[PDB]
Structure 1
Amino acid sequence: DLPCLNLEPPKMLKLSPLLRALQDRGPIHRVRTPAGDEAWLVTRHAELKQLLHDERIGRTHPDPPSAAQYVRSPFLDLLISDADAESGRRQHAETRRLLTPLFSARRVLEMQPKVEEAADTLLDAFIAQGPPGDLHGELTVPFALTVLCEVIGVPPQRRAELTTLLAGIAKLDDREGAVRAQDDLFGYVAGLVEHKRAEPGPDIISRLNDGELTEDRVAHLAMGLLFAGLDSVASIMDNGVVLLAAHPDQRAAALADPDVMARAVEEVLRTARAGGSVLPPRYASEDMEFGGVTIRAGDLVLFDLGLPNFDERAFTGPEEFDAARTPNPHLTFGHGIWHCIGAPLARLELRTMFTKLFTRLPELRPELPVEQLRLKEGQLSGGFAELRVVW
């Protein structure tokens, strides 16, 4: 009898009864996943943060095609190899050395004008169209994609076509459709990488080509970035709009002052999804005794960021949306060597759009009561199916 996890959408600002019960009853539990496999679930902020620094947990497994999974995704399968634990950790460290400088404070400051231009253009169009409008499909997804394309070096005309492909690679209910979407996207990206070698621009693909990587790895890094920076930004943005609409005093504080806005963006990150934010699978590379249990070599270890983010051991009043919360040690961008390398751009995108959205549309709010918002099914990182708003 292992507790069995599900894919039900979370409620606003509150862990589900199963997740609250597991967090109350200890820091780590053997569970069953939506795919039907067994896993460890870590439920508290201190212990999760401690596993994020434990080099026994990583993206290697002796036998990747029989490894326990949370959901079945040919995209996530690309992440796991049968390299030994040291060689995997080496691969990963090299990856971080190359991606980390692409988002330096200087480079992020240089990105700002185009992030702000893109938000203006899209918000003009959204507003021209008049209420009600699908915030998700017509604003947050296209803004995150536009920004990402500009930074990575994908031409803007490709935006409609990537929206389709990046949805395709994330299908959970259609293995062949997902493999095919992956082949097509990769074929496009690999063509783009080759173009850029002949004609470099101030963009990530060129910066990665200026180094010692194979064509193949440059393409894989670019494709991973395109998937990592799209629906994540949209999810945090969609939920921040819901939360900020629902908390008028908090919103007013945020818009009144750019330092409350910077704090408010961290509180949106902490509270956007109260559960269900389960990261790509990681595995123990050897047995380890942790949190009163013995994790075995090969066991799946799951990180659901809602759990630590709502842990009352780490946060005073974790169910309260406090736009001024400081400090705010949320784990929404991960930590340690599993830490978001795009976080500086994501934060810029969030401050930029929250500010413009609520400045221009002070009364912006979802049309439906929150409990009637519908989540996309059968899609990795799927977020809302639509987010109709009025103003």
Structure 2
Amino acid sequence: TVRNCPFDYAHELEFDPQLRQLLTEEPVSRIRMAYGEGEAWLVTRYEDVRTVTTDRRFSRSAVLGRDFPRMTPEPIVQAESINLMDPPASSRLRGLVAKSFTPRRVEQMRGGTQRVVDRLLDEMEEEGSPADFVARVSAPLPLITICEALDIPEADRPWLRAHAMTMMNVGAAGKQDAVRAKAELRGYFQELTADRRRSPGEDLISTLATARDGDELLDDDELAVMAMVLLITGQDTTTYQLGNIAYTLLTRPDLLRSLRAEPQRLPRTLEELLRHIPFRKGVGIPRIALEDVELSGVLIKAGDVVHVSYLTANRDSAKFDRPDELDPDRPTIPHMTFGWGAHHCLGAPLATMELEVAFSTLLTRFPALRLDVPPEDVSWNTTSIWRYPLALPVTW
């Protein structure tokens, strides 16, 4: 009755078979995952999952305090984080960083992102073919950008990601690691944010720390946590989707030619890769059903833990015809790669912009770009809630 879900599948970017089976055959299923007390529902259908993310009957505020079935021994979340608030209390702090990424603002920052990318490739060319696209592009760019954004000193950055990542370990014994790593992170911002509030720079932490509706909207905890949360998120998913997309383009010659034939297809192609590419293992933060809510003919009692799978949502044949096929031409329908509902991804805008400025430069600069080894020789991360390539040797 209750499925085992270690969610350990890692083979290339192949869609987790357990997930494909639960989509087609038990689109609402009882499950139990690596760590946490109790069990939880798993909703896998587009429309059903859309329901769960938006319908005020399901709270993420209600998760505060539960040993919720999750994939990391220590939960990645914190108390005062945007992740454990719903609208309305979310909408005020979301509201504030959302100013920072209006298309005017993000289509300004482009300028600098173009100069970062250019320099990163002006360096990879200098060290000469072959090279690691992960080391020389996919890893640095997202980290530079979010640090530039937050005015993070150059010396702290390699440190800060090697803590960000440590919190994303699914490893039983890397839990003390995680709780210390997390608290050291909290602390560093606790201070460096209280150092902006104090002598506001003209960066983004300053934008958060200085905004005042009469009396500063953000409390110090509320801020330090928001500056800490913006750093973590600004440098995992994006670094990974830069490797994932690269791999996919260098292993689907038809796709990669089509783009080289008509580069204008790129913003449409990226959406379709985004949809497809299963850019994580398992399921992230759940929600609690606040009241009984039947959902695909299955009552969910009040106080039950609900997970949604964004990855099965994207591959729902009810929404996308030939869903497993990767058609950048297909009738555009909103993907759920960037989340949905209240907690939809806050940095969608900026990762959009990084992915556009990256692959559009790559494509022109290195038309000849090819994977330098066979695809099955590429090693895929196993230790993370995310899926990404460890290295991506390329020629040009």
Q: What is the TM-score normalised by the length of structure 1?
A: 0.89
Q: Secondary structure at the match of 2:195?
A: helix
- CA-to-aligned-CA distance 1:62-86 (integer Å, 9 cap, x gap): 77243333432332354789x9xxx
1:278 aligns with 2:279: no
1:101 aligns with 2:125: no
1:381: how far off? 3.4
2:295 alignment counterpart: 290
1:97: how far off? 1.5
Letter in 2 for 1:145: L
Alpha-carbon separation, structure 1, partners of 2:8 and 2:379 = 13
1:134 alignment counterpart: 132
40-49 or 179-188: bigger deviation: 179-188
1:99: how far off? 2.0
- CA-to-aligned-CA distance 1:91-121 (integer Å, 9 cap, x gap): 2222221221111111111211111111111
1:64 alignment counterpart: 65
Structure 1: give runs of 5+ residues left out of the alignment: none
1:377 aligns with 2:386: no
1:309 aligns with 2:310: no
1:235 alignment counterpart: 240
1:9 alignment counterpart: 10
The answer (yes or no) to whether the contact 1:3–1:32 under 8 Å persists in 2 is yes
The answer (yes or no) to whether the contact 1:35–1:72 under 8 Å persists in 2 is yes
Change (3 A) 1:55 1:80: farther
Letter in 2 for 1:223: M
Alpha-carbon separation, structure 2, partners of 1:207 and 1:277 = 35
The answer (yes or no) to whether the contact 2:310–2:337 under 8 Å persists in 1 is yes
- CA-to-aligned-CA distance 1:153-198 (integer Å, 9 cap, x gap): 3234433222322222333321111121122222222222122234
1:20 alignment counterpart: 20
State which of 120, 144, 147 in structure 2 corresponds to 1:146: 144
Alpha-carbon separation, structure 1, partners of 2:3 and 2:151 = 45
**How many residue pairs were aligned?**
386
2:346 alignment counterpart: 341
1:338: how far off? 1.8
1:344: how far off? 1.0
Alpha-carbon separation, structure 1, partners of 2:131 and 2:80 = 37
- CA-to-aligned-CA distance 1:124-174 (integer Å, 9 cap, x gap): 222322333222233211100001111223234433222322222333321
1:152-167 correspondence to structure 2 within 5 Å: 152-167=150-165
Structure 2: give runs of 5+ residues left out of the alignment: 212-216
1:81-100 correspondence to structure 2 within 5 Å: 88-100=86-98
1:382: how far off? 6.1
1:185 alignment counterpart: 185
35-44 or 178-187: bigger deviation: 35-44
Change (3 A) 1:137 1:34: farther
1:256: how far off? 4.7
Q: What is the TM-score normalised by the length of structure 2?
A: 0.88
1:33: how far off? 1.7
Alpha-carbon separation, structure 1, partners of 2:176 and 2:387 = 18
222-231 or 14-23: bigger deviation: 14-23
1:339: how far off? 0.8
Alpha-carbon separation, structure 2, partners of 1:307 and 1:372 = 27
Q: Secondary structure at the match of 2:72?
A: coil
RMSD, aligned α-carbons: 2.6
Letter in 2 for 1:177: D
Q: Secondary structure at the match of 2:62?
A: coil
Using the aligned pairs only, state the percent identity: 32
- CA-to-aligned-CA distance 1:271-303 (integer Å, 9 cap, x gap): 121773523222222322111112123322222
2:77 alignment counterpart: 76
104-113 or 64-73: bigger deviation: 64-73
Q: Secondary structure at the match of 1:196?
A: coil
1:263 aligns with 2:261: no
